[PDB]
Write an enzyme that holds these catalytic residues in place. Sequence first.
Site, PDB file in Angstrom:
ATOM      1  N   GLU A 174      36.096  49.258  49.014  1.00 35.27           N
ATOM      2  CA  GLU A 174      37.443  49.611  50.395  1.00 35.27           C
ATOM      3  C   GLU A 174      38.391  47.514  50.184  1.00 35.27           C
ATOM      4  O   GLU A 174      37.105  47.097  51.267  1.00 35.27           O
ATOM      5  CB  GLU A 174      36.988  49.938  51.180  1.00 35.27           C
ATOM      6  N   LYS A 206      42.331  52.453  41.898  1.00 37.39           N
ATOM      7  CA  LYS A 206      42.685  51.106  42.960  1.00 37.39           C
ATOM      8  C   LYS A 206      43.669  52.456  43.787  1.00 37.39           C
ATOM      9  O   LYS A 206      45.595  52.498  43.180  1.00 37.39           O
ATOM     10  CB  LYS A 206      43.681  50.765  42.782  1.00 37.39           C
ATOM     11  CG  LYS A 206      43.022  49.312  44.156  1.00 37.39           C
ATOM     12  CD  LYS A 206      43.581  48.471  43.731  1.00 37.39           C
ATOM     13  CE  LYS A 206      42.525  47.158  44.019  1.00 37.39           C
ATOM     14  NZ  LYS A 206      42.591  45.765  43.257  1.00 37.39           N
ATOM     15  N   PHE A 240      37.344  50.873  33.908  1.00 34.81           N
ATOM     16  CA  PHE A 240      35.802  51.091  34.792  1.00 34.81           C
ATOM     17  C   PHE A 240      35.089  50.493  34.373  1.00 34.81           C
ATOM     18  O   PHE A 240      34.380  50.529  32.982  1.00 34.81           O
ATOM     19  CB  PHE A 240      35.838  52.951  34.886  1.00 34.81           C
ATOM     20  CG  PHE A 240      34.491  52.968  35.837  1.00 34.81           C
ATOM     21  CD1 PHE A 240      34.046  52.428  36.844  1.00 34.81           C
ATOM     22  CD2 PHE A 240      32.899  52.962  35.145  1.00 34.81           C
ATOM     23  CE1 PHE A 240      33.948  52.896  38.334  1.00 34.81           C
ATOM     24  CE2 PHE A 240      31.741  52.941  36.066  1.00 34.81           C
ATOM     25  CZ  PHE A 240      31.960  53.099  37.348  1.00 34.81           C
ATOM     26  N   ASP A 246      40.940  34.799  44.903  1.00 33.01           N
ATOM     27  CA  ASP A 246      39.964  34.945  46.068  1.00 33.01           C
ATOM     28  C   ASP A 246      38.831  35.476  45.533  1.00 33.01           C
ATOM     29  O   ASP A 246      38.861  36.385  45.033  1.00 33.01           O
ATOM     30  CB  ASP A 246      40.446  36.241  46.704  1.00 33.01           C
ATOM     31  CG  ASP A 246      39.795  36.976  47.707  1.00 33.01           C
ATOM     32  OD1 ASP A 246      39.056  35.414  48.547  1.00 33.01           O
ATOM     33  OD2 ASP A 246      39.646  37.688  48.570  1.00 33.01           O
ATOM     34  N   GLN A 287      31.427  39.719  43.884  1.00 33.34           N
ATOM     35  CA  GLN A 287      32.276  41.069  44.297  1.00 33.34           C
ATOM     36  C   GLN A 287      33.377  42.060  43.569  1.00 33.34           C
ATOM     37  O   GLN A 287      33.468  42.485  43.171  1.00 33.34           O
ATOM     38  CB  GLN A 287      32.281  41.388  46.441  1.00 33.34           C
ATOM     39  CG  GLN A 287      31.406  41.513  47.054  1.00 33.34           C
ATOM     40  CD  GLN A 287      30.925  39.521  47.606  1.00 33.34           C
ATOM     41  OE1 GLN A 287      32.118  39.000  47.579  1.00 33.34           O
ATOM     42  NE2 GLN A 287      30.121  40.005  48.545  1.00 33.34           N
ATOM     43  N   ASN A 288      34.406  40.845  43.299  1.00 31.63           N
ATOM     44  CA  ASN A 288      35.085  40.974  41.987  1.00 31.63           C
ATOM     45  C   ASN A 288      35.443  40.412  41.212  1.00 31.63           C
ATOM     46  O   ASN A 288      36.175  40.695  40.275  1.00 31.63           O
ATOM     47  CB  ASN A 288      36.706  40.796  42.999  1.00 31.63           C
ATOM     48  CG  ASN A 288      36.873  39.375  43.836  1.00 31.63           C
ATOM     49  OD1 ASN A 288      36.798  38.462  43.011  1.00 31.63           O
ATOM     50  ND2 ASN A 288      38.054  39.535  44.347  1.00 31.63           N
ATOM     51  N   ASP A 340      41.143  42.758  40.282  1.00 35.97           N
ATOM     52  CA  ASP A 340      41.083  42.604  42.048  1.00 35.97           C
ATOM     53  C   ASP A 340      42.417  41.378  42.346  1.00 35.97           C
ATOM     54  O   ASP A 340      41.542  40.158  43.653  1.00 35.97           O
ATOM     55  CB  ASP A 340      40.455  42.808  43.265  1.00 35.97           C
ATOM     56  CG  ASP A 340      40.815  42.681  44.528  1.00 35.97           C
ATOM     57  OD1 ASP A 340      41.910  43.746  44.374  1.00 35.97           O
ATOM     58  OD2 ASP A 340      40.150  41.875  45.123  1.00 35.97           O
TER      59      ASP A 340
HETATM   60  C1  LIG Z   1      38.367  46.074  44.523  1.00 33.99           C
HETATM   61  C2  LIG Z   1      38.513  46.482  42.922  1.00 33.99           C
HETATM   62  N1  LIG Z   1      39.985  46.520  42.257  1.00 33.99           N
HETATM   63  C3  LIG Z   1      39.118  47.289  40.881  1.00 33.99           C
HETATM   64  C4  LIG Z   1      38.081  47.167  40.895  1.00 33.99           C
HETATM   65  C5  LIG Z   1      37.124  47.562  39.788  1.00 33.99           C
HETATM   66  N2  LIG Z   1      35.818  48.015  39.657  1.00 33.99           N
HETATM   67  C6  LIG Z   1      35.117  48.689  38.735  1.00 33.99           C
HETATM   68  N3  LIG Z   1      33.805  49.367  38.965  1.00 33.99           N
HETATM   69  C7  LIG Z   1      32.669  49.320  39.544  1.00 33.99           C
HETATM   70  C8  LIG Z   1      32.744  48.224  40.989  1.00 33.99           C
HETATM   71  C9  LIG Z   1      31.610  47.702  41.769  1.00 33.99           C
HETATM   72  C10 LIG Z   1      31.041  47.942  41.704  1.00 33.99           C
HETATM   73  C11 LIG Z   1      29.506  47.671  42.718  1.00 33.99           C
HETATM   74  O1  LIG Z   1      28.603  47.645  42.065  1.00 33.99           O
HETATM   75  N4  LIG Z   1      29.729  47.834  44.060  1.00 33.99           N
HETATM   76  C12 LIG Z   1      31.282  47.829  44.780  1.00 33.99           C
HETATM   77  C13 LIG Z   1      30.491  48.089  46.310  1.00 33.99           C
HETATM   78  C14 LIG Z   1      28.578  47.567  46.043  1.00 33.99           C
HETATM   79  N5  LIG Z   1      28.631  45.677  45.771  1.00 33.99           N
HETATM   80  C15 LIG Z   1      30.024  45.456  47.109  1.00 33.99           C
HETATM   81  C16 LIG Z   1      27.655  45.770  46.190  1.00 33.99           C
HETATM   82  C17 LIG Z   1      28.521  47.681  44.404  1.00 33.99           C
HETATM   83  C18 LIG Z   1      30.463  49.188  40.637  1.00 33.99           C
HETATM   84  C19 LIG Z   1      31.485  49.643  39.813  1.00 33.99           C
HETATM   85  N6  LIG Z   1      35.887  48.481  37.566  1.00 33.99           N
HETATM   86  C20 LIG Z   1      36.900  48.508  37.716  1.00 33.99           C
HETATM   87  C21 LIG Z   1      37.833  47.758  38.346  1.00 33.99           C
HETATM   88  F1  LIG Z   1      38.703  47.848  38.068  1.00 33.99           F
HETATM   89  N7  LIG Z   1      37.677  46.793  42.244  1.00 33.99           N
HETATM   90  C22 LIG Z   1      36.216  46.402  42.493  1.00 33.99           C
HETATM   91  C23 LIG Z   1      35.699  44.960  42.537  1.00 33.99           C
HETATM   92  C24 LIG Z   1      35.276  47.661  43.675  1.00 33.99           C
END
Ligand SMILES: Cc1ncc(-c2nc(Nc3ccc(C(=O)N4CC[C@H](N(C)C)C4)cc3)ncc2F)n1C(C)C
EC number: 2.7.11.22
Length: 278
Positions: free
Chosen positions: A12, A32, A75, A120, A124-125, A138
């Site tokens: 989020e 997103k 993904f 940024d 996390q990103n 992101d």
């Molecule tokens: C902000 C954003 N835009 C597009 C994406 C994105 N996410 C994924 N897949 C993914 C991201 C994060 C996790 C993950 O392990 N968690 C997120 C929160 C938690 N962590 C903060 C501890 C764990 C799993 C899968 N794939 C492609 C994308 F483009 N994102 C991610 C950075 C959340």
Amino acid sequence: MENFQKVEKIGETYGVVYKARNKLTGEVVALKKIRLDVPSTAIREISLLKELNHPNIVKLLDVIHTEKLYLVFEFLHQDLKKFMDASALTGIPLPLIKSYLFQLLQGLAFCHSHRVLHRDLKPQNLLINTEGAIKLADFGLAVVTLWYRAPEILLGCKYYSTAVDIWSLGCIFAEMVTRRALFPGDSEIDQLFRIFRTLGTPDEVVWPGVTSMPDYKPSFPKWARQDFSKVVPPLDEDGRSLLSQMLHYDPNKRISAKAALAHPFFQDVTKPVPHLRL
Ligand SMILES: Cc1ncc(-c2nc(Nc3ccc(C(=O)N4CC[C@H](N(C)C)C4)cc3)ncc2F)n1C(C)C
């Protein structure tokens, strides 16, 4: 958006991210939903991002302007933060740290050659897969973490450069090695003062033009710089040499992504596969 089936929320500031399946093609994606209110400039700004394709940048597959802006990404199954926390026990092996650092520098080298900044970077990103790849996600595309913020931003620089991503990436590098955040500030002044305590308060010697930046105060405490051997043990001499150049105060002295890739630290670079539990 009717073509997509939400599997689960996976994240989020501006917008929520869902794992989702394309109802037609069975394709699994990150979906997103972007910060509602679209401005015409933001549409052409995202249409520029769709052309910015690299193996170390998460692929923007589609932009669904209706009517509510969605971005459909490739993904990836885990962020670097979760992997770091899952590895906190013996730490990420150095070969895999070197690999991840080299790959992200390659992504940044690419971004920056086209005058695109991330702005940024944080654990996390940064997204990882089972094949040893790490990808930027992101993109900062103009509570939030200040921990990876370059000092020029924190001192009020309006037209900052690609060097802000090198700073952030350097912070991330140190954190992978030490398993502790390098500058874990809980406000802008705390963040800044944590950078100052470790690297010394910047002056006109190490950073020309500093004392005339918007939020600089003559009345900041003046701390002496600490040793880097104190800051990132057990990083080796090459590793520490590289990190010091990624953490230079003067954005114009800070090493570029391109120059960093030629540093002796990467001489013995390889591509390990991580042990990931999904
Ligand atoms: C902000 C954003 N835009 C597009 C994406 C994105 N996410 C994924 N897949 C993914 C991201 C994060 C996790 C993950 O392990 N968690 C997120 C929160 C938690 N962590 C903060 C501890 C764990 C799993 C899968 N794939 C492609 C994308 F483009 N994102 C991610 C950075 C959340």
